[PDB]
């Protein structure tokens, strides 16, 4: 494993809703929201 999930959407910022499909060791975490910024 070296890849977990993806970030979709436009502006990738807290102005337009985005999508996050991060997967982990147990479940998946698909959600639609307006995440700000991470740099990590």
């Amino acid at each position: 494993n070296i890849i977990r999930g993806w970030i979709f959407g436009t502006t990738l910022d807290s102005k337009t809703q985005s999508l996050l499909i991060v997967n982990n060791a147990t479940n998946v975490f698909i959600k639609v929201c307006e995440f700000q910024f991470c740099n990590d």
Partner: antibody
Amino acid sequence: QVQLVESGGGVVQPGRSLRLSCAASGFPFIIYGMHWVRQAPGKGLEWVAVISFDGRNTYYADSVKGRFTISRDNSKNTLYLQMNSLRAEDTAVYYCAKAEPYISSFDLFDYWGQGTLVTVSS
Amino acid sequence: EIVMTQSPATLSVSPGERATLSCRASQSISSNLAWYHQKPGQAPRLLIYGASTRATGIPARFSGSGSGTEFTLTISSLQSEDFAVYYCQQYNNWPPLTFGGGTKVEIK
């Protein structure tokens, strides 16, 4: 590093045709759209045309609609612009600029070439 | 067609202090606008996109604000590479594509 190099400009007579090229390297050229932007001396920037990442979708400015043709060759990482029926006001410097998808399909010109000169006179 | 207008066409200010520029749109364009920096003889460079977000490699002194039809571009401290011409370009109405007349910032 990215590098957009233009060629094909020069001196032309009114009513004639010219072809310009803009070679691209240093980035995945096949997945990005490219534009042509011209700037008349003493004037601001003027949009001209745009071609999508494959070539089915193209748009033109109302001032050069019908006379200008834009095309690309993915197998060579080259961009062309075929100009026909050149008039006096088409004297300017043309720029080829890569497009970076934002909000819409393409709205930001993030990298620009040095530009070439096109002048028409008798 | 939506027409950009730049009120401060002429701007002379000595290095060190702040400079303020404005661009006006005939119709509401939300925050969909970009600023470009162009010295004489060179290709324009991207400075601000989204009317409030700086581009990569842009020093923090460059900033902007405004939404709708009124926008401003603010440079807190001008340096030796900042005296040039700035253009405002809208991209809300995608098909037309329009640019401002541009402002020339020079040394006082």
